[PDB]
Design a binder for this molecule. Sequence first.
Ligand SMILES: COc1ccc2c(c1)c(CC(=O)O)c(C)n2C(=O)c1ccc(Cl)cc1
Ligand SMILES: COc1ccc2c(c1)c(CC(=O)O)c(C)n2C(=O)c1ccc(Cl)cc1
Ligand SMILES: CCCCCCCCCCCCCC(=O)O
Ligand SMILES: CCCCCCCCCCCCCC(=O)O
Ligand SMILES: CCCCCCCCCCCCCC(=O)O
Ligand SMILES: CCCCCCCCCCCCCC(=O)O
Ligand SMILES: CCCCCCCCCCCCCC(=O)O
Ligand SMILES: CCCCCCCCCCCCCC(=O)O
Length: 582
Amino acid sequence: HKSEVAHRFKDLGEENFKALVLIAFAQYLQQCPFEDHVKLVNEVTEFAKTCVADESAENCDKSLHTLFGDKLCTVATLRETYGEMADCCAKQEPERNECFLQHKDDNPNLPRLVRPEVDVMCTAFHDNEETFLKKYLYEIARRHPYFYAPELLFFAKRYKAAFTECCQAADKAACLLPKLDELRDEGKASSAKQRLKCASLQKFGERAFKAWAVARLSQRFPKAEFAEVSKLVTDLTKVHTECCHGDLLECADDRADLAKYICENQDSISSKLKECCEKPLLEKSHCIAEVENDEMPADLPSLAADFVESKDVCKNYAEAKDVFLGMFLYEYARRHPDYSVVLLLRLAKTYETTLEKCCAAADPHECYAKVFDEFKPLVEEPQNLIKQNCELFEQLGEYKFQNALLVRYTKKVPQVSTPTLVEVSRNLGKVGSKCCKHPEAKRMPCAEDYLSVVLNQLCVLHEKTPVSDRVTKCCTESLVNRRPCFSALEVDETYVPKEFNAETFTFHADICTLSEKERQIKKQTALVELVKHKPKATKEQLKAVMDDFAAFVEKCCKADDKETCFAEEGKKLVAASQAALG
Ligand SMILES: COc1ccc2c(c1)c(CC(=O)O)c(C)n2C(=O)c1ccc(Cl)cc1
Ligand SMILES: COc1ccc2c(c1)c(CC(=O)O)c(C)n2C(=O)c1ccc(Cl)cc1
Ligand SMILES: CCCCCCCCCCCCCC(=O)O
Ligand SMILES: CCCCCCCCCCCCCC(=O)O
Ligand SMILES: CCCCCCCCCCCCCC(=O)O
Ligand SMILES: CCCCCCCCCCCCCC(=O)O
Ligand SMILES: CCCCCCCCCCCCCC(=O)O
Ligand SMILES: CCCCCCCCCCCCCC(=O)O
């Protein structure tokens, strides 16, 4: 069209426009104050209005990159505040924009955002919704310069829904606090998944990305043909590459194009895309990526037909190795919405290794004849781990289950930091209380989903300050081997126990006035420390100490005088427990 700004303004709407422009500026000029971004937003919005009125008004023909760059180069203290970035303003638009991307600090040194008391949030909310949401939208955006803006907007709307509902509530905190804690964690998940995807595309490359996509796309769109899924995997690959590079505009347009493409060829891809395809521009793709699996054909052939029995397997394979393997994947994925994607990759790899070391053999059909039999153990491993861990989780509750994982992992990698073990073990616990609620056929995909950010999360920390070759081994392993690798870790028999420390096991009355979350973390921390001191303790011996301690808390909190009780019964516990654990 003649004017990009006019166009984007028209189909986005003034409200969404103003919010996205704010997010975009905050992601670049991460250091400028809120008031300064607001002024820029107004100016751009006002400019946009001009172009809507007259497609030919001055500058309305300029591209969004150019306009955006010029306005960015308007900041007077660009050099005094951002220094080197100001030099970007000396380049021509193609490089100017590229120059701006390179200086986008992925993790600046801003103070952590503190959550104020519910009454002050609700009052600030009621007294001025706009500036209240925009300011925090600003705070989140500057800290997460790579968070896809439209999605960051999608979150804002959920935050607003939570205040609207909760601030008019009888018990505001009882309504708000849990909603904010859920929004936060979810916000974290989305952010980490985005970073992980881009990171993985760099290490492993396009082939791995494509395989993962064929598997995922065909599980969701089991009725589409392999050529449609291939088409989609290709476009999808261009979109992620672009979006990872960090250019919002290119990214947003690539996502829009793909979304309309899918919606137009709707009936040819999935029947569950109707809802999503009605929604407005800003939401289409977000919706589609989240869409539920379509129902499969039911009248579907046996894989062993074309991939085992049939002659020409090797002829079809040598003619185009990746396409044939992709075909396998497509065929195997759309018949298994219940398998995790990485499990579908393990099978595809196994199949590949087999065809390679078989198609170069006397009688092919016989060399690879029993390949589907190798799959069995690959499939069962993840299944058995799930049932097993969900069972245990049903018995104990979330908390006691978290404590079990705490003992398990501490004995495996005692070298790891206690606060790290505590955190990882807790999140792992939450993955259990979130996936085990699901019926079997959906558990594995669930776990994979959550378990992957947790494992990467833990791998990054270890990256910083490495403490074990084994963790490093699993962390640098292949995407397909990461989780099985951690699963294979055995008790660390080498580990030399920490010297006892009286302090570490001294508890005061403050443990009675602390919040549930706080109390638990103190107990759990003492637990990791317990195991690090007596790594040979039994589940029996251990459970006995945890039982004494259990009461010890109550017998001292619900006691006439604390302090003393904890120092009196406290001396006892430690002396006794030390003896039981020899
Ligand atoms: C102290 O524990 C946390 C945990 C997660 C946090 C933050 C602080 C902060 C604040 C800070 O950076 O200090 C942000 C921004 N977190 C997110 O990951 C996030 C991302 C997107 C949304 Cl929509 C919501 C939350
Ligand atoms: C629809 O296309 C994809 C492609 C890759 C994906 C995902 C989705 C999802 C999300 C989903 O499972 O739907 C995750 C988590 N991916 C990765 O971890 C990943 C794996 C390998 C590489 Cl090389 C790069 C990224
Ligand atoms: C997502 C952008 C909209 C901003 C609204 C967020 C309001 C809640 C402020 C609290 C943020 C601190 C993060 C947290 O710990 O919950
Ligand atoms: C000045 C540059 C900022 C202009 C705002 C960028 C336009 C955002 C369009 C988002 C389209 C939704 C695409 C999607 O489905 O993800
Ligand atoms: C057009 C379809 C292309 C998909 C290619 C299929 C390749 C499957 C190989 C199994 C995945 C192993 C991943 C890896 O180790 O890099
Ligand atoms: C079920 C969540 C509780 C935590 C225990 C982890 C069990 C899930 C392990 C299965 C991993 C699925 C991904 C994969 O196949 O590698
Ligand atoms: C940094 C110390 C924590 C490391 C603990 C490893 C956690 C691995 C998670 C794998 C979950 C699958 C269940 C399992 O096989 O143990
Ligand atoms: C050397 C032995 C010192 C004894 C220290 C005992 C502390 C163990 C913490 C037990 C926490 C279990 C959690 C719970 O009961 O809910």
